[PDB]
Amino acid sequence: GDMANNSVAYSGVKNSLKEANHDGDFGITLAELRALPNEGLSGNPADLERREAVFGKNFIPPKKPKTFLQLVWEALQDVTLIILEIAAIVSLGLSFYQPETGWIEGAAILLSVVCVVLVTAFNDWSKEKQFRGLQSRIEQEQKFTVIRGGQVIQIPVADITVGDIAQVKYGDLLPADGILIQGNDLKIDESSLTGESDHVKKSLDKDPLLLSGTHVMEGSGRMVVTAVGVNSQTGIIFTLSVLQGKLTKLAVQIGKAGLLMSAITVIILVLYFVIDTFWVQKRPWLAECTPIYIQYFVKFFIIGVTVLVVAVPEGLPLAVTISLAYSVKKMMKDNNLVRHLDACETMGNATAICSDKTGTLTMNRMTVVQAYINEKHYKKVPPNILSYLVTGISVNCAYTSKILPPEKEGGLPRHVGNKTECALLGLLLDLKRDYQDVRNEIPYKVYTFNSVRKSMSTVLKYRIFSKGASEIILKKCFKILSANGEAKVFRPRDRDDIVKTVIEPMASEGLRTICLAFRDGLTCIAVVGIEDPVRPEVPDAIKKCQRAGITVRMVTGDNINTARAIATKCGILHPGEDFLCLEGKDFNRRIRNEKGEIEQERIDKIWPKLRVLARSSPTDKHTLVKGIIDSTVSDQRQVVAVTGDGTNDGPALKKADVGFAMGIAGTDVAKEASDIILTDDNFTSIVKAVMWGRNVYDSISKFLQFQLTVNVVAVIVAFTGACITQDSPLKAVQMLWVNLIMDTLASLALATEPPTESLLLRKPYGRNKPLISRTMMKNILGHAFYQLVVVFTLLFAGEKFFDIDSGRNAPLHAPPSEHYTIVFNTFVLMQLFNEINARKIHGERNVFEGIFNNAIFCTIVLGTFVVQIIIVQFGGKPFSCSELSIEQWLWSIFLGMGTLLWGQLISTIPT
Amino acid sequence: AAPDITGHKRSENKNEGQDATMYCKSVGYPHPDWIWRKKENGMPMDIVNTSGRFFIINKENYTELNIVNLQITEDPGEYECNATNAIGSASVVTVLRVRSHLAPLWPFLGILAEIIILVVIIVVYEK
Ligand SMILES: *[C@@H]1O[C@H](CO)[C@@H](O)[C@H](O)[C@H]1NC(C)=O
């Protein structure tokens, strides 16, 4: 409890830029030492908890999410349910009294409505639990660069405190506000706070203040934390679709249709009763014994409401949200992390993937395959060669080969730094020489990549050297080491006889040539031979994607033949016909009249031809993707999935319909603007994302044919049975049980499906193609016909068939039934064996095969089977069944397997 | 007054060897005499005790017919009781049916046959 917190919430962070004239008598490291500078961390993992307790904790929570009691309250306000409760109370009300066991039919409605609303609430609660399970792990991974011991390591963003040091650069965020100390250029964004979406300098003269929720655009530097949590400024101010349109339209049409069909059954029932009693079969009996007649009106009205329960699916778009939730939690294991809940379904309808090359297709573990030291193209792998070791070993100060990973079995090491350099040093360690012996030698001026022509050079002992490209540096070169050796002064003899006749016949002709040049007009030490390996899965993956309609279009900043090499080696440019690449400049030349970028010509041309867009800019990728998603030729076009992880990848990645962002070496501005983070950069993970996007849109209709079948069969049974005899055969509790088997439990059952590889054999859908296809409708009407035939055979003639006496028709009081139990059991077990047969759209026939990837389906179907085994023998007079016995079970299970066979017969007779 | 039967079975399903318990409960005064009949070809017939399986216990206002050792060929049909006093008579109908002679076995074979059909179809298509 002793620090410099004299302003306890605005400690120095009030406003720019008249604050740097007086910052607690204007001394930045003095305020640091009064608050703690470079370079120390802590020793005590409780001292961090002291400054947690004293200003403060970083993690800012939302009011989350809702109590379970809140959702039980929420789902008991549907007007259908409250009308059902009211009529249940009235139904038992005209039992007490009338001029026995006429008591349970209302109590069963009341208690069962309590149970069905409890099950729907428990559903919705678990749904929010899986979205929290997503949200926790996406709250991780955002690490920073804290100066701890000089062995600087990445800690999570929540466990940061005040008094520590952050070492920031271009690409990442500001997690906690503060004070500059050291360097640099350091332009930042301020688009989250101020409307000036521009670039602002930061230095120790103007603005030593950094703001959380912004992100650095270029430069580097080093800061000291001021504030965290809600004590931070953004926290204080924070204190003070695509598919579902079709489902809402379809559900409103079903709502109107069922809302009229229930009223038809009600009107027919009251008319049929009053006519068949009092105006005909009459003898009018209008007398003082009224409430039995009002009691029959109550029973008719309960049939109407219990048909409206079935005929309106209570949550239909919640199919999308359930399936997408369970899909998110199982995607997270497949390297594929979803950040916005609309890029799951949208891709989806992918047509093009404007990918990048470096790291996304290749393995990004490159080697040094060839070389030119002994004058020529000798294959895979002397005081001038000592000088060559001085070049290849004294390149930088952060070469960082940490070579003894990962289990010390197979010689597969990884590295740290820009990986061409580590490839260079790695196959200069394969020439059995000590680089670490000569790296001390101590480091004059070793230039960075920043130069006029952008090489990276070194001035050391007066032996000045420089890495950098052959078409960048070899122009400046003066002479060649002659076989150890001597000097041979340049000419266009070199530029055509070596640069063309020897350099251009490189491998295919990759890759990325540099020189490692002597300085003092230069001297050709050697050049290269560089190759990064394509992943072993990529040439299968691009073919598997290519068959699925998606046209991959590689875009990179690279030159020039290199992209052609990797294109033909991967299989994008099938070298039969077409098409052509670019140099980098010509896409800006094609076209501007007059400056330009005419969407007429750019939307026209050259459209299917850019499979390679080499030497790009982020502005060039933005021009391309902005050209693609437009009003164009084919009027289906298009939905694109761009990748990319540069700092300047803001607008392009933002405009496209589904983003992607690398997540090994990928800057944080790219992730905050993204839509899906990949975790191991594999292009096969984009293939798996396309697979899951197929899977959601198939799982919706795979739910929907089951739900639509149960709706049609229940409504026609209720209507026609209620038109011949004066009641529906399904009483008002077991109708709610069929609600609970078709609406919440069914969606949770068969909406969770692992995908296959059969979802990659069809042309991708267009976003106007209808929701109930033809085979869809065939399965619907076929199973509807079979169940109407079985239910009406067991409803009109099951009494002269095996046994026993006709339940139709019956008085009010009543004995339960015996015959209607066989109707109800054949109906429910026939829907349960349908619930396997609705697992195949788009052709048949492997059911059951293979329902063992699901745990949920295989527990819900057999659980509902066992629950109905209990409900039929037990609780008879409440749940309107009776003590059913074999053999009648075994005939009903025979007819259930009957629908399992007849639906398999519907796999034939196509159109 | 006239006899009036109150409680009885409209049906009875039993199986082989069990004991079919049929009863009628009458009210009225005096207590009526009980006659059990059997419906044959549109005419009421008496119960003949050549099977040795009929046991009638008649009290004042309660009766009970108990037919031991049921068989499928003879014992199912239609039965009735006759509660008769000096004022009149009364009658209700209690119907018996027996489920025996296999008894339930035919659709179990149906299940197994249909399993074999669908498994054969899945075998044929996947090769
Ligand atoms: C039928 O005969 C047996 C044999 O004695 C006897 O016990 C039984 O009471 C008789 N039943 C009737 C209805 O006569």
Author numbering:
A (entry chain A): 2 to 37, 67 to 129, 150 to 290, 360 to 500, 507 to 568, 573 to 590, 596 to 654, 673 to 1063
B (entry chain B): 120 to 246
Sentences from the paper on this structure:
PMCA extrudes excess Ca2+ from the cytoplasm, a process that maintains a steep gradient between intracellular (~100 nM) and extracellular Ca2+ (~2 mM). PMCA belongs to the family of P-type ATPases.
The NPTN-TM and TM10 of hPMCA1 show intimate interactions through a number of hydrophobic residues near the extracellular surface of the membrane and are far away from each other at the intracellular end. These contact residues are invariant between NPTN and BASI, suggesting that these two proteins share the same binding surface with PMCAs. However, the structure of the NPTN-bound calcium pump differs from the E2 conformation of SERCA (root mean squared deviation (r.m.s.d.) ~7.5 Å) and more closely resembles the E1-Mg2+ conformation (r.m.s.d. ~3.0 Å). To facilitate the binding of NPTN-TM, TM7, and TM10 show dramatic movement towards NPTN-TM.
